[PDB]
Swiss-Prot record:
One of its GO terms (cellular component) is sarcolemma. Belongs to the annexin family. SUPFAM superfamilies: Annexin. This is Annexin A5. GO terms for biological process: calcium ion homeostasis; negative regulation of coagulation. InterPro entries: Annexin, Annexin_repeat, Annexin_repeat_CS, Annexin_sf, ANX5. Keywords: Annexin, Calcium, Calcium/phospholipid-binding, Repeat. Annexin repeats lie at residues 13-84, 85-156, 168-240, 244-315. One of its GO terms (molecular function) is calcium channel activity. It comes from Gallus gallus. A pair of annexin repeats may form one binding site for calcium and phospholipid. Collagen-binding protein.
């Protein structure tokens, strides 16, 4: 339900003033990252668009082009993302994820498993308007099997809305799932895809709790964390998001920095795409579910301008 983001409109807003600052910072002989990141992070997406607008109206130049022309590395990637209109992010994220050789079966999961129905019907529309193609097809072209079917079920954005309680059905679903969730999720997929894919959230939250009574343990148990295939990966992403989306992203952020190296891509995708929706909740979850500070982690795992930004989007100290 209701959640807080980390980025909220800036006041007193002045696109033009902001536009010249960025220009001044980028123009001339040197590049003043400090100012740029202090501006893009404290200004929300709807404001970066206006800033971008003023920027051109005053200089005949293209703000985003100009940013890509002066910035580099991750700080560049971060900065350019926070600028990407909030309306095409997923569509664009999805395009560069199904484009060319090698398919990001993970970005497809994250997005299609976390976005809302309104948000998804939007993705589909954007993808056509901007790229002039069909997300479904472009999806069914790089996907196959039950994985694809589940991916497609989600794409429809027709999950059953929340409502009264059908105790009968909750027992039915729990059981039905359980059997197939003991067969290592390989026997009769069509049916658990239907249940996990379309039932209301309030309903599934409930099937989860009963299935806990039928098997003696949670459902995320049956599915191997890292191992398994894209389906299990998606089955697991669906369940996580039904329970608590913020919990889902805090876990994704956790694994993004834990271990060998750091999956900066995801870190950048998560931190941005959530900045104005639930990042402030994700932050609270992280701690509660990991006995560790999300901020301090980003703090101790990155550096430079790249870091200064992130830590702000993270909510500062
Ligand atoms: Zn691109
Ligand atoms: Zn708390």
């Amino acid at each position: 339900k209701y959640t807080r983001g980390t980025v909220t409109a800036f006041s007193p807003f002045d696109a033009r003033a902001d536009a010249e600052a960025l220009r001044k910072a980028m123009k001339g002989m040197g590049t003043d990252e400090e100012t740029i990141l202090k501006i893009l992070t404290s200004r929300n997406n709807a404001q970066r668009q206006e800033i971008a607008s003023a920027f051109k109206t005053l200089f005949g130049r293209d703000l985003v082009d100009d940013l890509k022309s002066e910035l580099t590395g991750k700080f560049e990637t971060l900065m350019v993302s926070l600028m990407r209109p909030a309306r095409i992010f997923d569509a664009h994220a999805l395009k560069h994820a199904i484009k060319g050789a090698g398919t990001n079966e993970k970005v497809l999961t994250e997005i299609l498993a976390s976005r809302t129905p309104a948000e998804v019907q939007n993705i589909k529309q954007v993808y056509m308007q901007e790229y002039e193609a069909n997300l479904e097809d472009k999806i069914t072209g790089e996907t196959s099997g039950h994985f694809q079917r589940l991916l497609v079920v989600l794409l429809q954005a027709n999950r059953d809305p929340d409502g009264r309680v059908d105790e009968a059905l909750v027992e039915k679903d729990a059981q039905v799932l359980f059997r197939a969730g003991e067969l290592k999720w390989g026997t009769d997929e069509e049916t658990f895809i239907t249940i996990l894919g379309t039932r209301s959230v309030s309903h599934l939250r409930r099937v989860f709790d009963k299935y806990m009574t039928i098997s003696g343990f949670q459902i995320e148990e049956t599915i191997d964390r890292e191992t398994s295939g894209d389906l299990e990966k998606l089955l697991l992403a669906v369940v996580k998001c039904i329970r608590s989306v913020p919990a889902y992203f805090a876990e994704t952020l956790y694994y993004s920095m834990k271990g060998a190296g750091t999956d900066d891509d995801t870190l950048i995708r998560v931190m941005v795409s959530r900045s104005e929706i639930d990042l402030l909740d994700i932050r609270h979850e992280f701690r509660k579910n990991f006995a560790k500070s999300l901020y301090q982690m980003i703090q101790k795992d990155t550096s430079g301008d790249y870091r200064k930004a992130l830590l702000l989007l993270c909510g500062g100290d």
